[PDB]
Short mmCIF file of C-alpha atoms in Angstrom, two decimals:
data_model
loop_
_atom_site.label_atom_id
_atom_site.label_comp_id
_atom_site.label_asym_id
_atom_site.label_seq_id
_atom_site.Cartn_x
_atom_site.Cartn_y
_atom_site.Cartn_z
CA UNK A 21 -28.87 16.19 -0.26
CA UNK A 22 -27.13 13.21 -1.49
CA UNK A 23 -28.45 10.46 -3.83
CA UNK A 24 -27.45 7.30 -3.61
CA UNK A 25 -27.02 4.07 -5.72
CA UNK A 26 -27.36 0.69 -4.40
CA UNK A 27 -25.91 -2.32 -7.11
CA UNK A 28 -26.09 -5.75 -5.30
CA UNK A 29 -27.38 -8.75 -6.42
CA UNK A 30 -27.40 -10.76 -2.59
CA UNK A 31 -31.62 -9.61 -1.51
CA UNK A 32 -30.39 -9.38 2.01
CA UNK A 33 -27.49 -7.41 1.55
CA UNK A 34 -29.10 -5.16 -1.02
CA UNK A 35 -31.96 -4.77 1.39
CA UNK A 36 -29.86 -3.78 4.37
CA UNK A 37 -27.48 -1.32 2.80
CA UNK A 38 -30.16 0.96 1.78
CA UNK A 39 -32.02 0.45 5.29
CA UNK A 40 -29.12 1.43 6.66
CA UNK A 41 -28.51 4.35 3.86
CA UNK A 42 -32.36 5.54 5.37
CA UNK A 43 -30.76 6.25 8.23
CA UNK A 44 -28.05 8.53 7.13
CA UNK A 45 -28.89 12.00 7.20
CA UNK A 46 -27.34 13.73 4.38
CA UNK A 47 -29.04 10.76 1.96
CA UNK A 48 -31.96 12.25 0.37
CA UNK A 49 -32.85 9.31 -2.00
CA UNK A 50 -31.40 5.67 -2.64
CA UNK A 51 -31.88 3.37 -5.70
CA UNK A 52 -30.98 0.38 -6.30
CA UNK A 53 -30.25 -2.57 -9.25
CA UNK A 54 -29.53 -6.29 -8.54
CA UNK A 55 -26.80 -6.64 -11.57
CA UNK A 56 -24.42 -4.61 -13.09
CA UNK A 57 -26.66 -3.90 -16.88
CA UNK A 58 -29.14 -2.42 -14.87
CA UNK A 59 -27.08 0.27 -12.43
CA UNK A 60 -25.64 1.80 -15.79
CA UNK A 61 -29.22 2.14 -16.60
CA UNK A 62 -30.09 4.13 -13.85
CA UNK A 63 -27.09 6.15 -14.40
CA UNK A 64 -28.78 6.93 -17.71
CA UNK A 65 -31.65 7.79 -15.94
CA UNK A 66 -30.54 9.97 -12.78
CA UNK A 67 -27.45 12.00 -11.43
CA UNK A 68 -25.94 9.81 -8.58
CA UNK A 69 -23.20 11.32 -5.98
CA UNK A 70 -22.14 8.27 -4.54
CA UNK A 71 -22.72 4.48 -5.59
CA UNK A 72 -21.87 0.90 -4.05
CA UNK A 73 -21.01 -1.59 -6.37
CA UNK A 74 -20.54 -5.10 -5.80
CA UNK A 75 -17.80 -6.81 -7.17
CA UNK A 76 -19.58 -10.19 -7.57
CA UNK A 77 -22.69 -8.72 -9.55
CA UNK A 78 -23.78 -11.14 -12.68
CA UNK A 79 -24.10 -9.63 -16.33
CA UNK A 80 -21.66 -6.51 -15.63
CA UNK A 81 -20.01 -6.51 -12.42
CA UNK A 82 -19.32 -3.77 -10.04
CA UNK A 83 -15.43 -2.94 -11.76
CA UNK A 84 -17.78 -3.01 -15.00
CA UNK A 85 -19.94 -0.82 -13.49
CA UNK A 86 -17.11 1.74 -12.52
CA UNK A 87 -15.02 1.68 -15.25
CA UNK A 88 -18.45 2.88 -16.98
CA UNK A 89 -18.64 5.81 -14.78
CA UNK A 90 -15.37 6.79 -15.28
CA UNK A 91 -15.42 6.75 -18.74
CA UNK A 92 -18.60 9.01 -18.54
CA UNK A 93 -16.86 11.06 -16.62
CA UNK A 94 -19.72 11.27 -14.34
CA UNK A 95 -19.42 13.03 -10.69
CA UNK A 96 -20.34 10.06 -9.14
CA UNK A 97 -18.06 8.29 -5.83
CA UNK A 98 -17.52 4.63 -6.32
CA UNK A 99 -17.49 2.28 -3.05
CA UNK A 100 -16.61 -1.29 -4.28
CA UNK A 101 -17.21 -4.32 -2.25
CA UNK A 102 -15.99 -7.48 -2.57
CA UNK A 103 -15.08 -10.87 -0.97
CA UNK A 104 -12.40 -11.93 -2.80
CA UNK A 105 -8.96 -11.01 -1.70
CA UNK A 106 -6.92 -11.47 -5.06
CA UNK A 107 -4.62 -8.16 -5.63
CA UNK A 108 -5.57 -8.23 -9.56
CA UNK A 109 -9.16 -7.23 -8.86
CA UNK A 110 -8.26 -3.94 -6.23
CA UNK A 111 -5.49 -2.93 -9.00
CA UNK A 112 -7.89 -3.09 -11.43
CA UNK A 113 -10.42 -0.80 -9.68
CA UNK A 114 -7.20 1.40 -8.88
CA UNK A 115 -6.52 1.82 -12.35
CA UNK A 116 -10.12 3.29 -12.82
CA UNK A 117 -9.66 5.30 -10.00
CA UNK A 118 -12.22 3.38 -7.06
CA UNK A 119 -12.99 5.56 -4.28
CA UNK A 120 -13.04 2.88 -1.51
CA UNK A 121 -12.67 -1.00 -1.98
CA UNK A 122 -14.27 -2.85 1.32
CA UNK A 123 -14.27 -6.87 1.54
CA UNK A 124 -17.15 -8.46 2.84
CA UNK A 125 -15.36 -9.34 6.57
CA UNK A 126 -16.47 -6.24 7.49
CA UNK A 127 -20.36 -4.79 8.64
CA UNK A 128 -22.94 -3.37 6.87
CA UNK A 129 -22.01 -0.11 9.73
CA UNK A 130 -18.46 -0.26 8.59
CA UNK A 131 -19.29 0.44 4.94
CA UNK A 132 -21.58 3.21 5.75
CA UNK A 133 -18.45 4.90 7.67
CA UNK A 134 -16.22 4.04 4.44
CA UNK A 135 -19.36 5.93 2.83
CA UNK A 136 -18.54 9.17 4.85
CA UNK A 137 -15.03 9.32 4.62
CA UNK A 138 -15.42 9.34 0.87
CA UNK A 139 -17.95 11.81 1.02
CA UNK A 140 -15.80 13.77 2.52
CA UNK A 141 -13.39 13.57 -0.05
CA UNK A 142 -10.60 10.89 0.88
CA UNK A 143 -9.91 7.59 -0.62
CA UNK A 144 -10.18 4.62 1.75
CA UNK A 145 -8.47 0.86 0.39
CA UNK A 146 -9.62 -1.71 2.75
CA UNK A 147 -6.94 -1.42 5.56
CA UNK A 148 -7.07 -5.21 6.38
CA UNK A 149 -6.30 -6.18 2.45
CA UNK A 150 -3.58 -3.99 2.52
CA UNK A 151 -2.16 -5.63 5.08
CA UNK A 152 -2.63 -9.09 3.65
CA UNK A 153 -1.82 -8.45 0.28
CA UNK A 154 0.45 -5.07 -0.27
CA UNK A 155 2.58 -6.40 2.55
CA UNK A 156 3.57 -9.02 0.23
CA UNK A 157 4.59 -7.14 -3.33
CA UNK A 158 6.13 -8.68 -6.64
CA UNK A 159 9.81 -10.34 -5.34
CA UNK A 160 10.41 -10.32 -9.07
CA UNK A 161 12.96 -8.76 -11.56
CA UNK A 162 12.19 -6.51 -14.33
CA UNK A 163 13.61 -9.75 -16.54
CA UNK A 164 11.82 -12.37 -14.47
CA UNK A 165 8.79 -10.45 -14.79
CA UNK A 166 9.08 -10.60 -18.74
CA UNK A 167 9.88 -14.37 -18.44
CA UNK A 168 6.90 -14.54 -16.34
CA UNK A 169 4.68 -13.06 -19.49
CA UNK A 170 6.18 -15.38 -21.89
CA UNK A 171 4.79 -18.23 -19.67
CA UNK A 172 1.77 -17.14 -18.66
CA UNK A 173 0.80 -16.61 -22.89
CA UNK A 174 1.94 -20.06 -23.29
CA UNK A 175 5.19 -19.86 -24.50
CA UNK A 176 7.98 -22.45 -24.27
CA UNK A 177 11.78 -22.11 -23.00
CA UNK A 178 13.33 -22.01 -26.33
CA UNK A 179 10.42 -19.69 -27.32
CA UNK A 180 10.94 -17.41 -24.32
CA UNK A 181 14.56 -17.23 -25.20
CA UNK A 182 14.27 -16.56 -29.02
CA UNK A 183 12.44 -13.78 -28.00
CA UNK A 184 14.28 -12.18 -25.70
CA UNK A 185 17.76 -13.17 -26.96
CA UNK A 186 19.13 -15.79 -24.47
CA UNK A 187 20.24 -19.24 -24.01
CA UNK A 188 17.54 -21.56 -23.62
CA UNK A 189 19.57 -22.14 -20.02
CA UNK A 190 19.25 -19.02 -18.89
CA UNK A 191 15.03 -19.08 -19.16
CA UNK A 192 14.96 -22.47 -17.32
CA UNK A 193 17.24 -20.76 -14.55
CA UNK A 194 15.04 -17.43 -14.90
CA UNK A 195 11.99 -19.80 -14.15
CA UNK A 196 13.65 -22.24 -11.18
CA UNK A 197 14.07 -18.42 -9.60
CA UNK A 198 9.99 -17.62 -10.27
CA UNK A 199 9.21 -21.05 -8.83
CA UNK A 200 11.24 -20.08 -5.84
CA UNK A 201 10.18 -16.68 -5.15
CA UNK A 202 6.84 -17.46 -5.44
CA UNK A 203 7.01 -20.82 -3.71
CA UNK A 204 5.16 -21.92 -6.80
CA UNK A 205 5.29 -25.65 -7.48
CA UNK A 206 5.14 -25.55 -11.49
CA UNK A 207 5.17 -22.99 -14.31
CA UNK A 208 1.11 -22.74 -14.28
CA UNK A 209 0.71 -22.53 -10.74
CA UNK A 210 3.82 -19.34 -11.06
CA UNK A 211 1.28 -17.56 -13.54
CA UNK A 212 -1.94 -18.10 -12.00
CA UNK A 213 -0.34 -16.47 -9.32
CA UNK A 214 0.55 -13.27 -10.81
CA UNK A 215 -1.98 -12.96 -12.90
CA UNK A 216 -4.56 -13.41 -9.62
CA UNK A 217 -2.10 -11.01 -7.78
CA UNK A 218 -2.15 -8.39 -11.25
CA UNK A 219 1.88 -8.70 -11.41
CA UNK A 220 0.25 -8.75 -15.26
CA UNK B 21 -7.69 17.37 23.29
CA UNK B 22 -4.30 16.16 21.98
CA UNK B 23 -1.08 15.72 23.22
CA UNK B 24 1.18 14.87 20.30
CA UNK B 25 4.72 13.85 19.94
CA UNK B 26 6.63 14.61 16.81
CA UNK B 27 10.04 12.83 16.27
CA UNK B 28 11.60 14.41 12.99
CA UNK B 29 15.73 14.84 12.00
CA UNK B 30 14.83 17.18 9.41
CA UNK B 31 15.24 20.28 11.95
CA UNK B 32 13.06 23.29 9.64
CA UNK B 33 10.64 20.60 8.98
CA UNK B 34 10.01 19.12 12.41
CA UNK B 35 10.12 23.09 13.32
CA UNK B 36 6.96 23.52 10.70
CA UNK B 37 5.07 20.87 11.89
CA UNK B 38 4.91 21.41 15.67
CA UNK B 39 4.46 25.17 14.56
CA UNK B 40 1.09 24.78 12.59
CA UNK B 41 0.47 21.51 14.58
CA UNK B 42 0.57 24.16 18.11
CA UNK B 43 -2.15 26.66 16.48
CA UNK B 44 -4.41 23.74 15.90
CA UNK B 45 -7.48 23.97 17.80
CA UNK B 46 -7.73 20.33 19.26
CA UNK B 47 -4.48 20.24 20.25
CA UNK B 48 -3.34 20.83 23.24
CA UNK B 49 0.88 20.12 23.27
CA UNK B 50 3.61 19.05 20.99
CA UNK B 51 6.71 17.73 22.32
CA UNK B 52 9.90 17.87 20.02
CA UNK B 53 12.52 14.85 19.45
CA UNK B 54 15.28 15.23 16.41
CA UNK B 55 15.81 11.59 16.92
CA UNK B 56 13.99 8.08 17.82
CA UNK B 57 16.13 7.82 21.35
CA UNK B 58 15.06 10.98 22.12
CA UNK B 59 11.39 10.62 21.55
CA UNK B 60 11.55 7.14 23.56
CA UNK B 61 12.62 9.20 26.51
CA UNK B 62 10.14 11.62 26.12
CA UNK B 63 7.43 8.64 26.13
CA UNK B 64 8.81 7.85 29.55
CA UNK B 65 8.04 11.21 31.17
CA UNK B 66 5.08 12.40 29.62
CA UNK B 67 1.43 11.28 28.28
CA UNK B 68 1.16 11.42 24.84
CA UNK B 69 -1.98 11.08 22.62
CA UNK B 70 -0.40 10.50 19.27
CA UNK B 71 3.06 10.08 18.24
CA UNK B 72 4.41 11.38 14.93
CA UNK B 73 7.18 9.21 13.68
CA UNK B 74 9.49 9.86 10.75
CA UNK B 75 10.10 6.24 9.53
CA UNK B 76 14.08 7.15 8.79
CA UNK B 77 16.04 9.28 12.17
CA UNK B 78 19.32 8.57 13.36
CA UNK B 79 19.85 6.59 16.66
CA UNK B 80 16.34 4.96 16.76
CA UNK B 81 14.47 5.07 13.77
CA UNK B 82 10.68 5.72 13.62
CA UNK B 83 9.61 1.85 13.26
CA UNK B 84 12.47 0.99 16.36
CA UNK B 85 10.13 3.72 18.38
CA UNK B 86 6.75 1.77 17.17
CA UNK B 87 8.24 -1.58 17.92
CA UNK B 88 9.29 -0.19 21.75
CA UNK B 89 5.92 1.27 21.93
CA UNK B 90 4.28 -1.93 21.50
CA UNK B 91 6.45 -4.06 23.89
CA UNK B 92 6.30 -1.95 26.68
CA UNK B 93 2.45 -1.74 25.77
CA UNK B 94 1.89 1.78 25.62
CA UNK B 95 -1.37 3.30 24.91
CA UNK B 96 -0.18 5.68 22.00
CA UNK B 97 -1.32 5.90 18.71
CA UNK B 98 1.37 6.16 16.50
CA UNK B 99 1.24 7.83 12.96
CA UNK B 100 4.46 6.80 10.81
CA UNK B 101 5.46 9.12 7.71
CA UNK B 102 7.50 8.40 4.89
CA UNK B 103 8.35 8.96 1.21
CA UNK B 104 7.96 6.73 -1.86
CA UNK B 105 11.77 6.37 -0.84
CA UNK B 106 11.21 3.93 2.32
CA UNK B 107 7.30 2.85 0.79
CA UNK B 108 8.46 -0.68 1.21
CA UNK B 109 8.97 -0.47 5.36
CA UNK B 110 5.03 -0.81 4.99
CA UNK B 111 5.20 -4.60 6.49
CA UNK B 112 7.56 -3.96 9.29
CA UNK B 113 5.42 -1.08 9.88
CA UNK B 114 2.05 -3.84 10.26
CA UNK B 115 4.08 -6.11 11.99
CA UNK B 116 4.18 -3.61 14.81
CA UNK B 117 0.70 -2.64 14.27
CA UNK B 118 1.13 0.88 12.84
CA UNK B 119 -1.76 2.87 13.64
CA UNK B 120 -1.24 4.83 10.32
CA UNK B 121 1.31 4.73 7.65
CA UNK B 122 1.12 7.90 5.91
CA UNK B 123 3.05 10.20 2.66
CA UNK B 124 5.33 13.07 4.64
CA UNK B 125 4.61 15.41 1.86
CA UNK B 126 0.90 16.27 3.07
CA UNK B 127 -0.62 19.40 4.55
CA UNK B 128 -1.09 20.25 8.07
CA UNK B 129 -5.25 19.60 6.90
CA UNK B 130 -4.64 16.26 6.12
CA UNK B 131 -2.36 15.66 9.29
CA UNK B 132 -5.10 16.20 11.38
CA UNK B 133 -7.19 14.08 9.15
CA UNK B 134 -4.90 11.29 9.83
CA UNK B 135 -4.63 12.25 13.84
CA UNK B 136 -8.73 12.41 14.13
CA UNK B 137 -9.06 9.12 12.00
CA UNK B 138 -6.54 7.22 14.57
CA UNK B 139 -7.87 8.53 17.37
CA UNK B 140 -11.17 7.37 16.43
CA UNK B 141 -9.35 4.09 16.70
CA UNK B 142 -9.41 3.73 12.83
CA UNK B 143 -6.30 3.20 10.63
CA UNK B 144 -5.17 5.37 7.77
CA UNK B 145 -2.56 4.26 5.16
CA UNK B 146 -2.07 6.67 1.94
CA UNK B 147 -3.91 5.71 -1.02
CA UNK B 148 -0.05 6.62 -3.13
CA UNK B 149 2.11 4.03 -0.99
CA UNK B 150 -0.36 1.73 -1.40
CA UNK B 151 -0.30 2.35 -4.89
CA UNK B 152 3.46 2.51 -4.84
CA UNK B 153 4.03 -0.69 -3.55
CA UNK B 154 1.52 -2.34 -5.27
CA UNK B 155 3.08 -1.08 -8.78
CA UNK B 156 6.72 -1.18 -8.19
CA UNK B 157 8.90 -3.76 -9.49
CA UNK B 158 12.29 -5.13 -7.86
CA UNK B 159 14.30 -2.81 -9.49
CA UNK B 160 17.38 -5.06 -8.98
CA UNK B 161 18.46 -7.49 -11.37
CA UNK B 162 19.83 -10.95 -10.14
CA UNK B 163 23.35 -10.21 -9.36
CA UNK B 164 22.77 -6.97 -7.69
CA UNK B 165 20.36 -8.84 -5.54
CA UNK B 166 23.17 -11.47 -5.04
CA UNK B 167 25.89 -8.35 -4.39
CA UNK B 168 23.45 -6.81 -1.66
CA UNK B 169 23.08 -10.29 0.24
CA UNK B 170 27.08 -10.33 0.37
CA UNK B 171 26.24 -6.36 1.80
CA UNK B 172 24.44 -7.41 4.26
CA UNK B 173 27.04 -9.80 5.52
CA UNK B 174 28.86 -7.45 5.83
CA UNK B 175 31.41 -8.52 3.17
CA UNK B 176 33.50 -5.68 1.20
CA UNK B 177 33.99 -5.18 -2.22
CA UNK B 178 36.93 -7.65 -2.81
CA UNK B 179 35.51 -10.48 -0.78
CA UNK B 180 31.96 -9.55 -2.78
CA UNK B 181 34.18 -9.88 -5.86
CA UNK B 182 35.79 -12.99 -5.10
CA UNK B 183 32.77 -15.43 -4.70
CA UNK B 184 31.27 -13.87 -7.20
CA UNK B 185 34.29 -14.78 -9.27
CA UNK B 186 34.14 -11.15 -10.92
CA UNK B 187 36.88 -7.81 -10.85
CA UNK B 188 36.53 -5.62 -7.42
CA UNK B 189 35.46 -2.13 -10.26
CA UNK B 190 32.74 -4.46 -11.22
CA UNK B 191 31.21 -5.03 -8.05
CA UNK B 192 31.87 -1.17 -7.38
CA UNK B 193 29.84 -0.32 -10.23
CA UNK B 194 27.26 -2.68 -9.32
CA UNK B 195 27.16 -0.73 -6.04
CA UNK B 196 27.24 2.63 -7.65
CA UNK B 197 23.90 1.22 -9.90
CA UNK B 198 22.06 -0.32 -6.49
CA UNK B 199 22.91 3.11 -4.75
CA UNK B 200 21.01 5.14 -7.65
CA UNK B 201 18.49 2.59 -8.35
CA UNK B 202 17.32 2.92 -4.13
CA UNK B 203 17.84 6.26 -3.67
CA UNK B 204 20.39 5.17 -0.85
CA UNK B 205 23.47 7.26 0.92
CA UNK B 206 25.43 3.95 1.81
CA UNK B 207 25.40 0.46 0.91
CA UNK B 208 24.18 -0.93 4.52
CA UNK B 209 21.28 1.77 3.59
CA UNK B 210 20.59 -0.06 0.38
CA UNK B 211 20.86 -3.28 1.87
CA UNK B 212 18.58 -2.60 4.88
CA UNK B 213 15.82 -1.06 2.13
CA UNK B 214 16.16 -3.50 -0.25
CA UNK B 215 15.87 -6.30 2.80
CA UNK B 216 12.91 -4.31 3.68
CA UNK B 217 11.17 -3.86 0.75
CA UNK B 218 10.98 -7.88 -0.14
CA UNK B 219 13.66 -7.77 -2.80
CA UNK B 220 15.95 -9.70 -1.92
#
């Protein structure tokens, strides 16, 4: 039956995700790689129905790993894990089309159920991050949004304006809105925090 | 096994549902409610399992059933469906601890995905809302946003026009454009959705 790929760089993690993958009856074979270089290597080597990736791998990291896939087109299910909560990272492995995205709060036993219900062909997006984090979406305007951009690529007021064709009032206002909707105390801290969240 | 609840206002639709729902082999009952009131009383005579809740019904709508649910501490399980339309309820949904929060537009197969996964004490919330929400901009500008706040007052057009120092056919178009840009039938509907949804 079903083989299985293993990419984690944490020993004990590593090691008890495939102890617990022995136990699974329709696994026929695991592997496993501690960095991201080396699980495109094995799928190189070997067909692989269903791999865990770890977000946090060094050299290539788990989205790495399965935006490879998917550009290979391969048959292979992708189970990302993860401790960080940022939104920028789960759009990302939306946009490449994740299978299941699990943060570390939860067991080795709960990822090996998020294992099945992929398996048996439904998507599964950590339910506690989308409670956390989808609860709260972008506040801002199409036009706040592009004023967000400007800053963000290090662009002035007057620049901002040029560009878009409006009083270099208007921007400042545009931003004291950002500031406010985001409860962000200065320009840098407003784009750090869309570009963490992915509101680009 | 199950005794389900389906509250619908779509008549041939909530007809279709307790129809395939019936010939399901775990369940056991399906009781009928066209609106929210109506399924509340029906909670007060009868066990039910899992409760089927149209986010949107006249009277009491799906999330005022969820919320009564919860503060008269029920032991339901309660499955909420909606469209892309209403995506952005998703946090008043949470906030009354939604078992699932699900697309309408599904088969009767992945209904009874959803009813097994909550009964298993899991939740379930569709990979597309998620998506949805995630993606979606406010698709308000500024002074729309500031003509829905008067809205929600429950100022009219003139009075709407007069603070914001602008002709009563401008703030009528400005209605007409919220209307189509929320897929709303009022402007208390757009108001409530847009309040909802974190835009304004």
């Amino acid at each position: 039956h079903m083989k299985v790929l293993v990419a984690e760089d944490q020993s004990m993690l590593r090691d008890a995700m495939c102890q617990l993958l022995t136990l699974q009856p329709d696994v026929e074979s695991v592997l496993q790689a501690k960095n991201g270089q080396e699980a495109i290597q094995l799928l190189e080597k070997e067909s692989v129905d269903i791999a865990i990736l770890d977000v946090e791998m060094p050299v290539k990291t788990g989205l790495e790993v399965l935006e490879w896939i998917r550009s290979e087109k391969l048959e292979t299910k992708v189970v990302v894990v993860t401790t960080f909560k940022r939104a920028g990272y789960f759009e990302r492995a939306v946009k490449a089309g994740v299978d299941a995205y699990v943060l570390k709060e939860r067991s080795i036993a709960d990822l090996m159920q998020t294992l099945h219900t992929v398996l048996e062909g439904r998507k599964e997006y950590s339910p506690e991050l989308m409670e956390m984090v989808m609860t709260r979406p972008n506040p801002l305007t199409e036009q706040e949004i592009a004023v967000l951009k400007g800053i963000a690529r290090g662009l002035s007021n007057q620049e901002i304006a040029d560009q878009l064709y409006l009083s270099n009032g208007t921007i400042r206002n545009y931003v004291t809105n950002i500031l406010s909707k985001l409860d962000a105390g200065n320009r840098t801290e407003a784009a750090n925090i869309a570009k963490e969240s992915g509101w680009l």
